[model samples]
Target: SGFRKMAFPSGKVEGCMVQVTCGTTTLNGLWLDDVVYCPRHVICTSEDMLNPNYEDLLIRKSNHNFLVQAGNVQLRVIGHSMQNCVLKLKVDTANPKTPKYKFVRIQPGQTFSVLACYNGSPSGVYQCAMRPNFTIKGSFLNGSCGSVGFNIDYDCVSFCYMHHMELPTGVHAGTDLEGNFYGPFVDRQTAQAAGTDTTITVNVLAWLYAAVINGDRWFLNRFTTTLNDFNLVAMKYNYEPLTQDHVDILGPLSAQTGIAVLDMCASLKELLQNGMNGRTILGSALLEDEFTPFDVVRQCSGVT
Candidate 1:
């Protein structure tokens, strides 16, 4: 949906921080419970650090809350009062016109508001700002202090459409046959070309070459043994009396022989089409090339 105006309430961002307190065992930050300050949204609000009160210790010792920039939005401040009550609104504006500002005042109570707006612009990062000046101070200063942030939904299509962007990389499918965060290409070139071979041996070898490149090791493993059997069986077939059982055994064996036979036929087609002067197998003295993308339709339909 289009933004009639900035949509999210200040201090309500899921990952955004509101108040940050640092003490020996007590570290409280505004909306400190919901914050993530990590690379790629990690390292924020670590549930468990080695030290139970690690964040508290860090904040107390350093005397600085991990201040992040809250942009042109609004933050509703609600609480008692800091001695010198001031809303610690973290401001970060990358644009040259907007620099950094802090310690913005707000009213002392259960609710106050802040939002991000521009000096005089229609399009800018909607931020959370504060209104009705109150007392905001650091722990050492005996005033009110809090961290500020907002829960940002990166996948919200509303944001993506306006920015002409999609989900970040590595979120979607990969070569292993899985979903991708960024969806997928609408169309791609996909086709299968077959080679023809006069004798099965040559065709098997050609197919093996392609399979190796495709990393079809499983197929190759069964292929070698089947080819050897085919060679031996064919040799003895005419030499010995033809029997139903013997031939029947050969039938399944050949079927299990992997796609070498198919490859042999494919090789012949390739050679004949290339005018490589190869003898044709099965019926034709020569082969003609046929390029096919017919299977692509099935692939698009999610059919194996």
Candidate 2:
């Protein structure tokens, strides 16, 4: 539940390197059988990349050593040491016989231009989603031998709990069928509107985050079919009627039968997460004008 200061004898985190987190008590960095495990909320830097070794990492819950292969963890390599380069990985599933590598480049002295939630104090420290569980691994590269390390942080992410600070002067307010509130509002304000708080302009990102957390392939891909295509598929390909739950989730957006929302939600996850610059995707009416973080949060913010 708090800091568990530690020093590893075998070098998971060593001199000039420290791992800090509030979510787990596994202080020395979870390692087993020459394998590395990342638990919920870890922040540390290592020059290991100065002699980097690429390896597969196991994601696990802080309470145990089992693999969360059913998929409830999130990993983000928010910062790296480089002439501007680092590598992170994805898997091929089925135990992952190979790797899906991704590279992120950053300036040596310039603060990386990142989505607001990921940015910290001078914009170098990283923050992961909290306690949904994770640790992190990255392959940082340097040409002609240079010092390299990664500051990785991991945790749960979804827009469900984030407050909409400036939503249309009054939005991000709403409630479910059970009479719980979720929406935009000027009259209401969160405890101390955080600097990183959303302005409702980022609801699209929230929706996109919510959709992925809720189930991307289904919520996004399934609802993403344009109404025109849905009609044609029903005729030519015999696509079945939109499920009742689908209709409920999409709500009014389902009626428009257009590219702005339905397809937008599905398409965003593909292009955005490879690295995010998603602020421009918020033009739709559902996100900007209404910004139902109330609705979205109720379904996604694991805490609620």
Candidate 3:
């Protein structure tokens, strides 16, 4: 059971899909001094939990979480124009015993990782599930809260899905800056507004857009629930502790899921092994507190 990187990309994006032998590098191979977080993220929202059909949606969203395999993904705060939400960045080592990190709020021209790592993200039950890798560790600048719009720059590895020793550079991918009454989701009132696609992935992008551009608390909370829910669900699969919830990190754990988090793919491998079940998604739901542990702004457009 090679529960490392998933085999998808061979050479590069939209290129070969087969695993090809490389003279220097191989699949999931370490290609940089710095580490990278999976471009694909797992997010959860509290509003979704209230719905009758939260389980099925949660399950699919959890599976959609993908990994970067290898690369130095640069996270940048591109859209905080509303000024309602500022963000902080904290980068630390994946220490076996005691780990260390620092806090640096978002600053103009300052890259997220450049801030040492690098949001005022959201409040109450808004959380992004991070991977528990032995190499890298850190939160998305919040404990059980929220964040703003961001752009990722992959300098090293290709993007597909996989695990590796290390990830690569601060390559410039693109900037995320948008505005308008437009936004894109999951349920009848929450489905994607654009293509009408109901996939969980599409909803993530939509909800984020909704939250950023419109400052809509409804969508923001939903976005939070989706990521955090995925984290908890996958955490169970990774064999993380029962008490290892978002609140634990935001509260006693000093606002850092830090070590509690695990690789998204790690959960994927286990989910596939055990096959998703109620026990995995709803682990100790009754025992857990009333959304205790749980835990974005946006860009401006033509108006400027």
Best by TM-score: 2
| lDDT measured at residue 2 in model 1 versus the true structure, 0 to 100 | 12
Q: Estimate the lDDT of model 2.
A: 0.25
Predicted structure with the largest lDDT when compared to the true one = 2
| Candidate 2 lDDT trough over 10 residues, lowest sum | 130-139
lDDT of 1 at 112: 17
User: CA lDDT of 43 in candidate 1?
Assistant: 16
Stretches > 4 Å off in candidate 1 = 1-34, 37-64, 74-304
TM-score for each candidate, following the candidate numbering: 0.16, 0.18, 0.16
lDDT of each: 0.24, 0.25, 0.22
Q: Per-residue CA lDDT of candidate 1, range 82-156, in tens? A: 111122222332223221222221211111122222211112133221111211111111111122222223332
Candidate 1: minimum summed lDDT over ten consecutive residues — where?
157-166
Candidate 3, superposed: residue stretches over 4 Å from native: 1-179, 184-265, 272-274, 278-280, 283-304
- Residue-level lDDT of model 3, residues 159-262, one tens digit each, is 21121111222111211111111121122222222221111221122222322233322211111223445546544434332223332333322222121222
Compose the digit string of candidate 2's lDDT tens values, residues 240-284: 233334435455433323324445534543343333333332232
- List CA RMSD, all candidates: 24.8, 20.7, 24.0
